């Protein structure tokens, strides 16, 4: 592609991959924003004789789709790469433009006219980034720069891949290489010959996709992991570590996307803790985003940290985010690894809260709002089966409108009646609580009775709390 | 007598303009080094603590060995601070 | 072109044949500003007849780059210099122009 490799790091390198990965995977939608400068347009406009760059993004239906009158396939139907450069201006005089994409890029084929036909284009969007990623992170959506009417919910979960287009460095003549490289024509060829494979099924040999895949994240890291594979191994000799280096950045990209989903969508898109489980040694890894436990100052109210031992019995410190909006009293409940455990605990809460409205909202009525309430762990530790009290607690906090206090882990757990229960190892609690950065410990009175078992130099750490019923417990945690 | 560590919180939240917490009783005092000393009649001390209407207290580290002296029903009543050394008890104190 | 060198200085004559640049650099842009009547536009319209003057600068995407309904390129396709005048109220009406 005429870059000098050595001038940069690995993870760049793969990116760089995961730009050619359009040319060699069937209809392999992906979306690529970054800084200026970073050569982002020269693969798909000087570097490859199956390429169209689209200058402005400013493409009409049938220019694009099929010419109904002159009875011509569109652009899909000529071109295996189609890239969208500068997409922050396209703006469609056909409404359909959005919509045509949106079904091409679910089915790979478009009904127009008097038929259905099938096109293998691959659809590329290169954007430019003014502000920095952090602020962009913080403040919006990674997908804001995409205009207005293209930032849909169902139109962003067809991309296979989004690309951190600010991890390659800005672009400097030191980075052209002078050695011996490939044809351009030999690789494009290449690129077209293998589209033809596939090896997208590579991965059931060795792996298997987590719970929180649904049908089309397994459709795009499946995919992307066939572009991968394509693009370094052709010959079709690979081992089990290459097709989780493979595996492993698919998921991240795709999980990037399932983030902006998340935070443009609500509801539908919590489930963005993508993982793997290894089908030899059964053991699961999680991945993470690279640009993306518990910082000072009061967080944002029905926001809380629960600790808790997992199923394994191990401590395990997750976060409870209550969403509130005006409804009808209705529960919605996410992250709660679909165990049904935690599950009826957050309903048995939730129905005491119900009951017992009155006195701890001070005249909010609960009927009137409807609360979605999501559970992130913190530590990779595993499930967590108790939760009613810290339920309870964040839906006071959420309702109230008041903030959790800064620094504390809500303990104990709650019966339908009003009774609390002690806390099992309370001594590791708080060892992960002070490892998490708790600094205030709100706890059950009837733990008290096992103070003696903590040891003074992680005791001395905790603002300790003691409550007697959930309504304490309440407004003991909120303040 | 045992006046030293009060009067280093009162210093600190003076200068600093710095309201201390409400309903926050110091305990233990310090030498002219910095060494702090375990709170003498820790019971009593926080029972007097409790009828005043104390809801925080702030205690030496050294004096949570005697917390296991301290009954659980007025143990209950507080959210207790432990701090070090009396800079930790000025940052406890003043929040 | 019709001056007078010996009534011009150097630095003049060299900014002179940096006019005659576009003429002869394929895909060469470049931008000129200065005080009216310094004979800016007189090469670009009288003195070749291979250049183009498109006076006004509103002038449409179609017409200058490609028209998919002809399926016939624009100016840029047959002229070896587009110069633009009056670059201050030039405007597309196409916001991809």
Request: charged share 20%; with cysteine.
């Amino acid at each position: 592609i005429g870059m000098e490799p050595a001038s940069l790091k690995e993870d760049v390198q793969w990116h760089l991959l995961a730009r050619m990965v359009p040319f060699v995977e069937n209809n392999y939608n992906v979306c690529e924003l970054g800084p200026r400068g970073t050569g982002k347009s020269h693969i798909y406009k000087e570097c490859s004789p199956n390429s169209i760059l689209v200058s402005g993004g400013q493409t009409t239906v049938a220019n694009l789709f099929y010419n109904m009158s002159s009875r011509r396939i569109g652009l899909v139907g000529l071109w295996d790469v189609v890239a969208f450069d500068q997409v922050a201006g396209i703006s469609f005089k056909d409404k359909d433009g959005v919509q045509i994409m949106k079904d091409y890029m679910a089915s790979g084929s478009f009904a127009r006219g008097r038929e259905q036909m099938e096109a293998s284009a691959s659809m590329v969007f290169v954007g430019n980034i003014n502000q920095s990623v952090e602020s962009l992170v913080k403040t919006s959506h990674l997908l804001a720069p995409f205009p207005e009417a293209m930032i849909d919910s169902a139109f962003f979960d067809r991309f296979h891949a989004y690309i951190p287009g600010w991890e390659i460095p800005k672009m400097r003549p030191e980075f052209f290489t002078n050695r011996y490289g490939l044809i351009v024509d030999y690789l494009a060829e290449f690129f077209r010959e293998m589209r033809k494979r596939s090896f997208a099924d590579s991965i059931e040999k060795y792996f298997k996709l987590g719970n929180n895949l649904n049908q089309r994240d397994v459709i795009a890291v499946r995919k992307t992991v066939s572009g991968l594979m394509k693009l370094l191994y052709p010959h079709g000799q690979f081992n089990k570590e290459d097709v989780r280096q493979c595996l492993e950045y698919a998921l991240q990209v795709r999980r990037r996307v399932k983030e902006q989903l998340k935070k443009i969508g609500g509801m539908e898109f919590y489930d963005v803790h993508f993982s793997y489980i290894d089908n030899d040694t059964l053991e699961e890894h999680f991945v993470s985003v690279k640009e993306q436990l518990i910082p000072e100052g009061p967080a944002k109210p029905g926001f809380l940290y629960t600790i808790g031992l997992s199923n394994k019995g191990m401590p395990g410190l997750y976060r409870l985010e209550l969403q509130v909006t005006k409804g009808s009293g209705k529960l919605a409940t996410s992250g709660l690894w679909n165990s049904s455990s935690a599950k009826e605990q957050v309903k048995i809460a939730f129905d005491y809260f119900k009951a017992n409205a009155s006195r701890i909202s001070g005249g909010s009525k609960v009927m009137e709002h409807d609360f979605h309430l999501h559970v992130v762990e913190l530590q990779n530790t595993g499930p967590l089966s108790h939760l009613a009290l810290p339920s309870l607690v964040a839906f006071a906090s959420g309702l109230l409108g008041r903030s959790v206090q800064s620094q504390m882990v809500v303990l104990g757990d709650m019966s339908l009646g009003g009774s609390v229960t002690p806390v099992e190892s309370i001594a590791e609690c708080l060892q992960v609580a002070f490892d998490a950065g708790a600094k205030k410990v709100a706890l059950p009175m009837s733990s008290a009775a096992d103070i003696p078992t903590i040891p003074v130099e992680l005791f001395t750490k905790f603002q300790t709390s003691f409550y007697a019923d959930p309504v304490d417990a309440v407004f003991k945690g909120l303040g």
